[PDB]
Amino acid sequence: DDNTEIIKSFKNFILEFRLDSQFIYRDQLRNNILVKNYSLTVNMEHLIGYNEDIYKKLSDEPSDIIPLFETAITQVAKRISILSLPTFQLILNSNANQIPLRDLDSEHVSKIVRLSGIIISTSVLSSRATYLSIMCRNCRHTTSITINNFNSVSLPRSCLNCGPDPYIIIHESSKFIDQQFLKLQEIPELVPVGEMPRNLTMTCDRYLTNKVIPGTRVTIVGIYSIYNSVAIRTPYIKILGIQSDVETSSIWNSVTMFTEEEEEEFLQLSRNPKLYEILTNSIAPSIFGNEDIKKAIVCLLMGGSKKILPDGMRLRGDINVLLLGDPGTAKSQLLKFVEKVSPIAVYTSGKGSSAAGLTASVQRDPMTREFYLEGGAMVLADGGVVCIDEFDKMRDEDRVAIHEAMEQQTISIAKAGITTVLNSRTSVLAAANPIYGRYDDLKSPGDNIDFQTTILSRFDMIFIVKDDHNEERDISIANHVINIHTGQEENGSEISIEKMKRYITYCRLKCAPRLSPQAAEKLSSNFVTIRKQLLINELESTERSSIPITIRQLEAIIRITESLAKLELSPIAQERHVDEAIRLFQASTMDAASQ
Amino acid sequence: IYVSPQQDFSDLMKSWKNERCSPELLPYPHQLMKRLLNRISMQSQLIENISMGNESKLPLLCMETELERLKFVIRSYIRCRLSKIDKFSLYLRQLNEDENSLISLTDLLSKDEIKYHDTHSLIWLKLVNDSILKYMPEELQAINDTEGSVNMIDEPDWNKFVFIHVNGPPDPLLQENEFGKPCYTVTIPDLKEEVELTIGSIYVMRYEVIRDLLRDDKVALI
Amino acid sequence: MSLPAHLQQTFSPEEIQFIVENEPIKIFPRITTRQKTRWQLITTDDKALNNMVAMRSTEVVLWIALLLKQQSKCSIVAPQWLTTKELDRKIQYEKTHPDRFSELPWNWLVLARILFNKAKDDFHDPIHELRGKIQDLREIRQIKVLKGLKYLNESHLQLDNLSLLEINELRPFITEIMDKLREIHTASL
Amino acid sequence: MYYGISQFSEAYNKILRNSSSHSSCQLVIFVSCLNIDALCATKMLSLLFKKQLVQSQIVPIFGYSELRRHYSQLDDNINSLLLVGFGGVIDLEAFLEIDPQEYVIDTDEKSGEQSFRRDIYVLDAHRPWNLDNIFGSQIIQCFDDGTVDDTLGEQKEAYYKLLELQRKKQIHEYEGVLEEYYSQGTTVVNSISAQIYSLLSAIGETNLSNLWLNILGTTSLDIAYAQVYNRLYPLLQDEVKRLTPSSRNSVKTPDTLTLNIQPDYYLFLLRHSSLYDSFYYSNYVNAKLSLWNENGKKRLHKMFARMGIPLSTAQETWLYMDHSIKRELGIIFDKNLDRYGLQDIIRDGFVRTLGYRGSISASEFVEALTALLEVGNSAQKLTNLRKRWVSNFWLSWDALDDRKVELLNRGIQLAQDLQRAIFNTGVAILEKKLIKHLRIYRLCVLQDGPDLDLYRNPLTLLRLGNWLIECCAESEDKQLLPMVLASIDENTDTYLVAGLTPRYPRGLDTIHTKKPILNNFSMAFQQITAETDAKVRIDNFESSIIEIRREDLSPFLEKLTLSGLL
Ligand SMILES: Nc1ncnc2c1ncn2[C@@H]1O[C@H](COP(=O)(O)OP(=O)(O)OP(=O)(O)O)[C@@H](O)[C@H]1O
Ligand SMILES: [Mg+2]
Ligand SMILES: [Zn+2]
Structure with a gap:
């Protein structure tokens, strides 16, 4: 009765909506059916413009009208693609105000809401039924049921004598769809005073599955509903749309999510003669000086290139950076910026961490009594960067639990039957203090550093930041900080965080330069000289150097060269990059070792 | 055979479309182009004369716009012809060098086109002989060799597929089909197949087979 | 070289519009040029323009008609195939004959786009209805083209009553795929 | 000379007759870079000339120095020059060094009139008219809105007699009445867009787009000269009622265009x-x-x-x-x-809808256009800033086309940002009590604000000035006192002073409120600049806005207080 009229109304929107000379939804449908994507994304501002009455119904009773807009889409799709196809999914976009995760309460039950959060977990896909074929136990009578996944359905209780519940499902004739579960945590800043962050369970269907990964900020449009698991119901959100700032699909598979128009911008930016300067200036615009550390951070974000030799050996392609220095140097602020610019990043404190917190931990499911594996900081940061602050407060065991994941980029587990070798391809950016809090020049370098040579050799570049009291520099820093406190270039000398992050993603998924012979000869000669320099320094002092120079440093120089080449989308690394890489190595690691 | 300016424009457009879609370099319509250029000059002089001297505003606008249209058509036609000459320079040189061949460039090209062909060939040969060919032995020193592993002279794609519209005569080759409609019969020797080309229909045919019909104006490429 | 790579072997949409704009159309002059200066053209006929009378049907080239309409000195008379009823009939014909294309003119899409853009007050039917009908017809013909593309082969192929803009859209794919098929077949022998 | 209301058709026919030949362009239009009414009027004129195929050139112009430069740089093939939004107050013939003899083409003794190569048309709403342009010159042609005939008879008589010349007494009294006429302040009495729409109605070319542009131009004066808007409102209502189709029972279609008169509100970007x-x-x-x-x-x-x-x-x-x-x-x-x-928030306005799109009111459209003008995006820096504003003119001009809606949305966003910034700056001004209440006027000088780069544009400075004028100045039952607002910019070490006229309590019809209030700051500023070695720049079209050096403001304000002519 009314259902047919509602279906007719939503069908006329898809067939009559033109903003100029193009039918936006009719053409979107045809283009989607051609690539086998049975869905239509509709913007709710367009529906409020066609007929406000249709929006009033879709917002007053969402779980009753949404199922009738899907069938209208399916009918129009059949009319457009078939010359005389499952039920089509409807994905919604809205610009309504976002309700804070913790402000959702009884006043929003069964209503369309928009909210943001952080995805902390994702489930293994399940299978939900969409068309059952049933039969009767006694008289063997065949029937079918059709189900929409919008709850306010079960097998018939009485046959069509036959006892109660006479119907058994015939599986080889039924059809199913995909279902996923997500946990959404509220943003750290939104949380009220003295409160732990709160979770919320979410479910997505069909083409909204496998769209997010744990640890990524997302925006959700859905229905705040309830399901019975006494007179209380556990709330949850039925997703109707997902929007994210991270192209997770490009990151897991190939290069994707870059439009040709967007791609053209990246090539134009790469063609800039002084992209290195722009990127260096774009990191921490509010921190004065420390240019070398900012260049090192650019190289770390860019990364090197990984090689798999024919015999099977793999060569690490990531760069690890350590910041040792005195208080007030802005190491923690640099780490907090790097966590915010990188596409994937985790900020962790060495004190509030553990060996299982990093890597992976073995957990027991209370229901199935079965042990399973949950990823830690280094798994949650896979393919990105881990910012381990307070690296000196970490316990010896928890620090030792990081060697293999830092070098081999794998997390071997052998616990509770579970036996595996996970993958953790992450870059470590660590900040630490010397033993006495300040780097005391009076005592030998072996007295100011408690890190063992094994852990230190795993860092590509080591920065020993010393705070020297110079009146000119002090006045400059005072002026800069006061300007910050009392007080937008965007004129080719700096790019916002979003653009820089997208450019990092593009470069990582598009380029992997290789060394030319001249660079190889140059780097090889430099390694021989540096090793001789360590030996002359060692012969002079009975004490064995605390900062080592092993083959890992040669590989680190190669990685820095490759990252500098990749920064400009150059398929080959030339001497103009080798010189910069050698300069950075001398400015950080040989500088630390010389003292 | 001159008929009227309208007919001359119609043949110009026919030639333009055929040249754009054809794989080979068609013969140059000397008389038509001569008439068209002379008419262009005369019409330009007439427009200038009239302009030198408000109801007369619109006619002048129309004449100038028509002159622009005609100039554009001729420009595109000549540019396409020059590009084709660039692609098939060695092939045309081979035609001229052979004496048994019927076609001669003085008939297949205009004076400007022949001048362009000779000058550009000389320029490119100078460049390549300086850069590369002067180092190779005497054997590999020819820019037009056909006895090597790969033939260096590019010939037109004879069997290229081209959309055609069968518009009939403005006839011995014409006949009727089972349904009674007029039609043409052609044979594809590669497949030994005979294909009917009924009038008023659109086909995607090989160029070689319908080449004679195109030359006689029985079909026109779209 | 002399010719860009995107204009080689095919025409651009502007070239198709240029070709379409030389066909005659019917206009109602708002001025009386007939005498009881003078047009002097060389690409078309000028007798019709020299003989115009207010509110009297006459035929001129499409581009001249558009130029006159820009001055509010003529009202273009839309073709007979571009009425609501005729488009309904063509849609029905397409629906009942899954294996053939309707007998629309070879310039229906281009002329529809030009007249909708330029002469919006010269139609006797609401413009939105005509736009919807043309969209429907385009979708049906697109379905038919998609179905018919499954019969590409090393021999000829026939696409009757397919318009100029659609053929221009499909020319690269069809020609290149059939050329590759022919190359494979010929290599076979 | 001046063209009456009925002579607009004659002037338009003259422009068509002279500057219309498909061979070359012979028309040029100069527009105030930062006046919305002039923008809309020039858009109307551009469409009108496009219809008749008249080749033209449009040159945005900020200040009188640029006007002089461009006029000097004009070619000799230009037959007609159009000035919209300025030129009425200054002496164009003297300012532009126009010698009528040099510009003469042919002279007929029998006719008693001379023909000139160039003609200059003035479309200005400001007052008072410069009696030289109106009555003395012939190359200058001024588009009047009836003032010359309604209330300029005695001035005309005095000027004609003065030109025509015991006699010392008559001469003295005539120069006295002329000086009395020149002593009064400057005000805007009409909208140029209304004048152009009257011309279009005279020649019969009025449609819905022209009416929309006319409404935008007229409503751009609502904030400041409400008394002009209240007078022009009935004509706009009648025009909308006349143009609108009688029947509205038809449902919305993707092409339907609606132009209603709905209840509007004095709220900032409600929709x-x-x-x-x-x-x-x-x-x-x-x-x-x-x-x-x-x-x-x-x-x-x-x-x-x-x-x-x-x-x-x-x-x-x-x-x-x-x-x-x-x-x-x-x-x-x-x-x-x-x-x-x-209570006065309740109002009636114009709302325009394009099928299946959001409906937008005239006030919000004007706000978006102004925001695009303002923040759309030694002498060298000044020239660069003026070039940037001339650039913004074209963004605002594009936003007037229905094919460009992204620009309008961008303008609305920028307008919201600008209003937020103005609110913050006004809060900072009022909290600190930076307003000094002298006996002749109020003063407010900004020296260390957080967003002081914004107020280099006269439009943004006037926005802040209006905000201040309404709050705690319009109200509080305090006497009406003109206000002076100044702002600094370290990049050039100078002030941008801006006198502002006081405004009566809004929506309070009264005999005293009926009378208009003039802006006398132009006269006092010019007098002080001439008397003192000020180094003031008075090149801006709005004579109430000048530029001062960092170290001259104190002497300037002291002399301002001592002048007593404010
Ligand atoms: N250019 C700057 N250089 C140094 N500190 C800065 C700078 N700009 C701001 N700061 C201040 O630095 C403080 C952050 O501490 P910072 O990151 O410098 O410590 P750290 O040296 O890394 O750590 P710790 O003192 O524990 O060794 C913040 O208060 C920030 O205001
Ligand atoms: Mg710290
Ligand atoms: Zn039963």
Whole structure:
């Protein structure tokens, strides 16, 4: 009765909506059916413009009208693609105000809401039924049921004598769809005073599955509903749309999510003669000086290139950076910026961490009594960067639990039957203090550093930041900080965080330069000289150097060269990059070792 | 055979479309182009004369716009012809060098086109002989060799597929089909197949087979 | 070289519009040029323009008609195939004959786009209805083209009553795929 | 000379007759870079000339120096020059060094008139007319709106007699009346767009787009010269009623264009922001509630609570707001507003809808255009800034085309940003009590604000000035006193002073409120600059705005206070 009229109304929107000379939804449908994507994304501002009455119904009773807009889409799709196809999914976009995760309460039950959060977990896909074929136990009578996944359905209780519940499902004739579960945590800043962050369970269907990964900020449009698991119901959100700032699909598979128009911008930016300067200036615009550390951070974000030799050996392609220095140097602020610019990043404190917190931990499911594996900081940061602050407060065991994941980029587990070798391809950016809090020049370098040579050799570049009291520099820093406190270039000398992050993603998924012979000869000669320099320094002092120079440093120089080449989308690394890489190595690691 | 300016424009457009879609370099319509250029000059002089001297505003606008249209058509036609000459320079040189061949460039090209062909060939040969060919032995020193592993002279794609519209005569080759409609019969020797080309229909045919019909104006490429 | 790579072997949409704009159309002059200066053209006929009378049907080239309409000195008379009823009939014909294309003119899409853009007050039917009908017809013909593309082969192929803009859209794919098929077949022998 | 209301057709025919030949361009239009009324009038004229195929050139122009430069750089093939939005007050013949003899083409003794190569047409709404242009010159042709005939007879008589010349007494009294006429201040009496629309109606080319542009031009004067808008409103209402189709029973279609006269409100961008933000960022609401302090916010929250609108609902954007409250807004507002003194928010305005798109009102369209003009994007830096503003002119001009809607949305966003910045700056000004209340005028000088780069544009400075004029100056039952606002820019170490006329309490019809208030700052500023070695720049079209050096402001203001002519 009314259902047919509602279906007719939503069908006329898809067939009559033109903003100029193009039918936006009719053409979107045809283009989607051609690539086998049975869905239509509709913007709710367009529906409020066609007929406000249709929006009033879709917002007053969402779980009753949404199922009738899907069938209208399916009918129009059949009319457009078939010359005389499952039920089509409807994905919604809205610009309504976002309700804070913790402000959702009884006043929003069964209503369309928009909210943001952080995805902390994702489930293994399940299978939900969409068309059952049933039969009767006694008289063997065949029937079918059709189900929409919008709850306010079960097998018939009485046959069509036959006892109660006479119907058994015939599986080889039924059809199913995909279902996923997500946990959404509220943003750290939104949380009220003295409160732990709160979770919320979410479910997505069909083409909204496998769209997010744990640890990524997302925006959700859905229905705040309830399901019975006494007179209380556990709330949850039925997703109707997902929007994210991270192209997770490009990151897991190939290069994707870059439009040709967007791609053209990246090539134009790469063609800039002084992209290195722009990127260096774009990191921490509010921190004065420390240019070398900012260049090192650019190289770390860019990364090197990984090689798999024919015999099977793999060569690490990531760069690890350590910041040792005195208080007030802005190491923690640099780490907090790097966590915010990188596409994937985790900020962790060495004190509030553990060996299982990093890597992976073995957990027991209370229901199935079965042990399973949950990823830690280094798994949650896979393919990105881990910012381990307070690296000196970490316990010896928890620090030792990081060697293999830092070098081999794998997390071997052998616990509770579970036996595996996970993958953790992450870059470590660590900040630490010397033993006495300040780097005391009076005592030998072996007295100011408690890190063992094994852990230190795993860092590509080591920065020993010393705070020297110079009146000119002090006045400059005072002026800069006061300007910050009392007080937008965007004129080719700096790019916002979003653009820089997208450019990092593009470069990582598009380029992997290789060394030319001249660079190889140059780097090889430099390694021989540096090793001789360590030996002359060692012969002079009975004490064995605390900062080592092993083959890992040669590989680190190669990685820095490759990252500098990749920064400009150059398929080959030339001497103009080798010189910069050698300069950075001398400015950080040989500088630390010389003292 | 001159008929009227309208007919001359119609043949110009026919030639333009055929040249754009054809794989080979068609013969140059000397008389038509001569008439068209002379008419262009005369019409330009007439427009200038009239302009030198408000109801007369619109006619002048129309004449100038028509002159622009005609100039554009001729420009595109000549540019396409020059590009084709660039692609098939060695092939045309081979035609001229052979004496048994019927076609001669003085008939297949205009004076400007022949001048362009000779000058550009000389320029490119100078460049390549300086850069590369002067180092190779005497054997590999020819820019037009056909006895090597790969033939260096590019010939037109004879069997290229081209959309055609069968518009009939403005006839011995014409006949009727089972349904009674007029039609043409052609044979594809590669497949030994005979294909009917009924009038008023659109086909995607090989160029070689319908080449004679195109030359006689029985079909026109779209 | 002399010719860009995107204009080689095919025409651009502007070239198709240029070709379409030389066909005659019917206009109602708002001025009386007939005498009881003078047009002097060389690409078309000028007798019709020299003989115009207010509110009297006459035929001129499409581009001249558009130029006159820009001055509010003529009202273009839309073709007979571009009425609501005729488009309904063509849609029905397409629906009942899954294996053939309707007998629309070879310039229906281009002329529809030009007249909708330029002469919006010269139609006797609401413009939105005509736009919807043309969209429907385009979708049906697109379905038919998609179905018919499954019969590409090393021999000829026939696409009757397919318009100029659609053929221009499909020319690269069809020609290149059939050329590759022919190359494979010929290599076979 | 001057062209009466009925002579606009004659002037247009002259322009067509002379500067219309498909061989070359012979028309040039100069436009005030920062005047919306002139922008709309020039758009109307551009469409009108495009219809008749007249080749032209449009040159945006900031200040008189640029005008002189461009006129000097004009070619000799230009037959007609159009000036829109300026030129009436200055002496064009003297200023541009125009010698009538040099510009003469042919002279006929029998006719008694001379023909000139060039003609200059003045489309200006400012007053008073410069009697030299109106009555003495012939190359200058001024588009009058009846003032010369209504209220300039005695001045005409005096000027003609003075040119025609015991006699010392008559000469003295005539120069005295002329000086009395020149002593009065400057004001705007009409809208240029209305004049161009009258021309179009005279020649019969009025349509819906032209009416939209006319409405935009006329409504651009609502904020300042409300008394002109109130006078021109009935004609716009009649035109909208005449052009609109009688029957509206037809349903919306993707092409339907609607132009209604619905209840509008004195709220800032009501239809593109929340109901809360419209009240919060409104000049009138802030004036009548003092939102710049906490008590004002408490009072606004009390008002919303009384009206029955939840705070969460009010802060929701316009499109997605609960529709029951949206429908009832007219009823809820009418009973509730009178209690809080915000009753005059109720108004009737123009709303235009394009099928299946959001409906936008004239006031919000004007706000978007102005915002695009303002923030759309030694002498060298000044020239660069003026070039940037000339660039912004074209963004604002593009925003007038229905094919460019992204530009309009971008303008609305920028307008919201600018209003937020103006609110913050006004809060900083009022909290610190930076306004000095002297006996002749009020003064306010900004020296260390946080967003001082914004106020280099005269338009943004006038926006802030209007905000201040409404709040705690229009109200408080204080005597009407003109205000001076100045701002500094370290990049050039100079001030941008701007005198502002006082305004009567809004929506208070009275005999004294009926009388208009003039702006005398031009005369006093010029007198002081001439007397003192000021180094002042008086090149801006609005004579009330000048530029001063960092170290001259104190002497300038001392002399201003001592002048007594304010
Ligand atoms: N250019 C700057 N250089 C140094 N500190 C800065 C700078 N700009 C701001 N700061 C201040 O630095 C403080 C952050 O501490 P910072 O990151 O410098 O410590 P750290 O040296 O890494 O740590 P710790 O003192 O524990 O060794 C913040 O208060 C920030 O205001
Ligand atoms: Mg710290
Ligand atoms: Zn049973």
